[PDB]
Amino acid sequence: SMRKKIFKPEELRQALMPTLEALYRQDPESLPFRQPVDPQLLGIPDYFDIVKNPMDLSTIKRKLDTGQYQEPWQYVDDVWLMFNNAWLYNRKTSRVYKFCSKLAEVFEQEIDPVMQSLG
């Protein structure tokens, strides 16, 4: 069958970290994504009922820093999970939803040349 895990996790860390840094540079749009959603703090007790697999920038960063991503698409999947969770949970008219859309646009712009560099 197909080859798997051809890149070292540390090669993926080096190649992909600039795309994550681009998200962190978005001010104010990254602020709601820097830390895990806290439903008690935010007064949204249904959050974990709706969002079964939460994700945020700090979790992605720690996974990439520590070499937990073994394939480039696993990193992409977690970034998309973060955005899809926020689009699912929040009203389309909301500030967090709009900020999510901004981060997603930045991510798409940054990820395509990096994925090409892994080709």
Positions touching ligand 5QR (CB under 6 A) are 31-33, 35, 37, 42, 86, 89-90, 96
CA pair distance 84, 77, nearest whole angstrom: 10
Q: How far is the CB of 74 from ligand 5QR (least distance, A)?
A: 21
CA pair distance 97, 69, nearest whole angstrom: 27
Nearer to ligand 5QR, 7 or 97 (CB): 97
Q: Which residue is nearest to ligand 5QR (CB)?
A: 32
Nearer to ligand 5QR, 16 or 100 (CB): 100
Three-class SS of 55-81: CCHHHHHHHHHCCCCCCHHHHHHHHHH
Q: How far is the CB of 32 from ligand 5QR (least distance, A)?
A: 4
Nearer to ligand 5QR, 43 or 119 (CB): 43
Q: Which residues lie below 8 Å from residue 72, measured CB to CB, with a gap of 6+?
A: 7, 12, 15, 16, 115, 118
